[PDB]
Symmetry: C3
Subunit: 412 residues, 3 copies
Amino acid sequence: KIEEGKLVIWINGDKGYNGLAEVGKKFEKDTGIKVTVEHPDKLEEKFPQVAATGDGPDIIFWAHDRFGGYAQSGLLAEITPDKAFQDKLYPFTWDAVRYNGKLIAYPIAVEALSLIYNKDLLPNPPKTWEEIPALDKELKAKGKSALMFNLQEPYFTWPLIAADGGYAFKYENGKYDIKDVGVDNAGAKAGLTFLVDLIKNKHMNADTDYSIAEAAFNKGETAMTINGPWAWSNIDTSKVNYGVTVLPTFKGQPSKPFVGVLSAGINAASPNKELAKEFLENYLLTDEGLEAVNKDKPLGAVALKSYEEELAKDPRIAATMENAQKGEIMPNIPQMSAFWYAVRTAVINAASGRQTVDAALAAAQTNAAAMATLEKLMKAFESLKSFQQQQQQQQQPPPPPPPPPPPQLPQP
Amino acid sequence: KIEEGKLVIWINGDKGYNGLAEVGKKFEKDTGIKVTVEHPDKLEEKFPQVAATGDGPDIIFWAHDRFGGYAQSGLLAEITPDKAFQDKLYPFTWDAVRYNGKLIAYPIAVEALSLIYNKDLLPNPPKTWEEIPALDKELKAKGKSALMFNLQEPYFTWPLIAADGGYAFKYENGKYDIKDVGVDNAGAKAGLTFLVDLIKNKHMNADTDYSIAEAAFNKGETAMTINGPWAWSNIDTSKVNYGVTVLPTFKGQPSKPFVGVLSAGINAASPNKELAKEFLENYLLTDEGLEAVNKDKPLGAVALKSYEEELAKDPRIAATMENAQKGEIMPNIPQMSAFWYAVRTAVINAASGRQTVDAALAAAQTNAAAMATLEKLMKAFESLKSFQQQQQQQQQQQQQ
Amino acid sequence: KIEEGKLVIWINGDKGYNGLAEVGKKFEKDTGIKVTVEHPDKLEEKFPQVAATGDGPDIIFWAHDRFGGYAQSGLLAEITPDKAFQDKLYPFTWDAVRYNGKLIAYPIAVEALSLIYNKDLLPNPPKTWEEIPALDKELKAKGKSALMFNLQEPYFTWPLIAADGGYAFKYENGKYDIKDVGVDNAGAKAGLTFLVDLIKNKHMNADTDYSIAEAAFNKGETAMTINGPWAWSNIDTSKVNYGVTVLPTFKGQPSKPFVGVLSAGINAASPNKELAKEFLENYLLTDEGLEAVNKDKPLGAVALKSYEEELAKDPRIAATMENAQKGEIMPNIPQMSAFWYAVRTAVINAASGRQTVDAALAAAQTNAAAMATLEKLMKAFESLKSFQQQ
Ligand SMILES: [Ca+2]
Ligand SMILES: [Ca+2]
Ligand SMILES: [Ca+2]
Ligand SMILES: [Ca+2]
Ligand SMILES: [Ca+2]
Ligand SMILES: [Ca+2]
Ligand SMILES: [Zn+2]
Ligand SMILES: [Zn+2]
Ligand SMILES: [Zn+2]
Ligand SMILES: [Zn+2]
Ligand SMILES: [Zn+2]
Ligand SMILES: [Zn+2]
């Protein structure tokens, strides 16, 4: 059982669930139908469990990439807008919501890293990456630095690498290319080279993590950081005089950061397929639907053009969206996890001297590719161990030289 | 014994081997050549060991699907009939015996599932699936259900899943796009959904199997069942007045049942290749040859067009042919082993509430691909270890 | 080590590093840039350890076959000899030094198996495989056999199996289609059928390894052997009147040896990529350059035309080049190892009578396309669980 004649929605408790419920109210008052919004724990964990017995929420709200696996398990119902409607959203957000060519979620809001500079010690920010070292001569010479951001994690380093032509997978004709990794090429190489050069030239540090990186900007210690929206509130506290903007060009190229997208999926097991659509198209994805949620907890930049323009009047929001256009969507496939991991150790070793640029990046391509094949066999092993006859664990691994065979046979 | 100079044939007990032994006789007149016929045991299991070391029969009769295995391993000789012999048989039986384009065996009998119904409870078969819920009440109102058959096995339940777009792997060119599985499409989805309803609406029981369903039908308890021509003999015995017909359409579409073709192949090792060809092409696949084998043990439909027409005079045989002319030829590849269990699972989850249709069905495809490539890599690794110690124990140790 | 404004070269201990060293002495004269030839142990093992931290020599000498792996690990630089200079080397050698479009090395020398025959027993060697049974029972009449060579290793047997149509992987674009394995076809089937026929008519023995074969020939027991230029020095010592010639044809088709190439590669981490190529293009890959190296030890046949034509005045060397020209350049890809032992097993079972040609030949294909991706999963385990954690 799910509902029937009523809507039950799921959204992460950290979001504007209060503001959303009031749209469910405007909706009960317009159609006479009850909207119950819920905020459970590990819902992104619980969902695939219950949705799979035919249960859970009618609608679900989450970052888009987690949906790849949902839509894969066949958990999301394919959605049905007219062309006239899709024209109301920045068209690239539509890219964030398709799988084997099928649209599977409504895209709510948009996340991306931007460039954050302390307006006090840097009134004008660098328009390109290549200025930053030479500018360090200035700032290091008043006992300050020019830039500091997390180096322990690829998500942060990736906008530079990708800039010159680097890329995860070839998204092309509404479809990803799982052989075409693009992390070995010309652009990724020069990208990671620059990044390592700075850590050799001593413009940066390789044990720079999150705690370490964030602090320094918050204490007017470095002029710039790279980070996304989720970070604002803490700079706000610090009292540090700040601004937010486009990412500096590298080799005349825009930096290409990874875009995450809040999305609204419809449970494939929902009786109320028609109502939910109705709620999302006609009530939520409206200026007052979004302005509503946004009031409870701000959304970053929004998907709806109309409301983006009204919201864009924040220089900080303006940047977030501008960068998010200049960026690449983040893939919702299985393969993505392996990539992350391989590129982590790529940059760890390259920046630690451990390995050269040209070699480590090539390793990530081949080292991360050998895992995608390994990950599906691991799922094949547990399915042949399952039955083969929400706790819940979980023998797990490891494998090696195990079986097994099959059964017997019928006949007569 | 590498055969040599004479013809030895393998084949199975459940077949008319004496009627074939009689074809070995007639042949022996005009060439003088002696055809022995052995009906050994698990000769789908002996043949790959005997013919590993150049031995076994010159020829083997078995179902086509097993031959892709033989054929793959390199065990069967590519055969060469001309244009003119080829048109003696339903061209569709030909794609049943191609491996990577090469014709590789001889087509004999054709096997498909059929609609089997009690003319006494029900005078008239439904051309349609949609109307089965309706029929059930008419019948259950007189202490009788409309339709019962094995729900546990995917091979029985496949035809409705297949009906509207479903397929194991895609065929395009005498070859099988193994990356083109289609149990996730809407067709499969629709068909599975429909069956699942029939179960939840108590028009059917999920614990229904071959035993129960064959029995219920044979005790005049359910107006209909789905079975193949193997079970015809029990229904005669039941003294139930049965008839057999084409399977019901779904969404206007014919049911798509898995086809099996009885097939004869030539040991890639056989010294007697020219011999065997003349025997089958000129003595067996003649109206009289099949007759003999059939008069011994019946064959169901046969690929030989002209004796096939004489057999359609039995209405039951006529519909086995109709059911199969519309069916999905059963694949002979490795990823078929895989595909069965994945579907066996999905269908059972879907029938039990365990999972939803879209889900249960959006797994097998992923599980089969992973289960197949798992099967192909683990047993090659096992064959690597097997012949590694078989070449070191008696060969490397032999020196002791 | 690691380098910086001077050159350092590695090349295996058993080669003309002295000639090579004395080219350094010439180069250093017109430049003032010191070259250093070192030949450390297991250098094909160590180089990928140290090229991987931005270290090792500036330039590396080893057979093209191991360079696949280096380039694939991003370890060597791309090389850009202009079109005029590629023209100086035999065109087909350039194929041995290309990896996914990229030119990754300079060919030097060429190696391949050849027919070595005893002149005293065999004034004139056969052009044909098929007449060897004739030849053998002509010879068994004087207690001598026609041919003995290494049957336990595919490298030696392949040239026959390949002769009528076999191939490892398909090549037709500086790229090796690895789903296209050609060990399952008519050519190779028959090519194996014949070899196996020889063995079961006693016209040849099943257990013939390398030594048995070297001995048999080196003590004039057998008229012919198949071997490469490495065997030569011992048939000098064995004092046998001997000839190195073209391999016999089969079903009218050139026998197809596997071709190996000594190649010179630049560390992608090398700070002197310019000099490196100036050295190689203007000092080493010149008559005098090779002449010198070739003097310390013979290179065999050489990838450079002009000086190749000088060495081809020696019939043995010329026959190496012609066999080389009719053979299969060796795949440098990873699926090549997987190729090897599978064909090693195919033969050993077909030749043992344990399996038919067709069964064994098809079984190798299952192993070739399975052990190749199993090695990819091997790297997915070790080089991940180790450096990953932990
Ligand atoms: Ca609840
Ligand atoms: Ca087994
Ligand atoms: Ca069955
Ligand atoms: Ca017998
Ligand atoms: Ca008749
Ligand atoms: Ca040194
Ligand atoms: Zn909560
Ligand atoms: Zn600097
Ligand atoms: Zn307003
Ligand atoms: Zn009903
Ligand atoms: Zn040494
Ligand atoms: Zn003979």
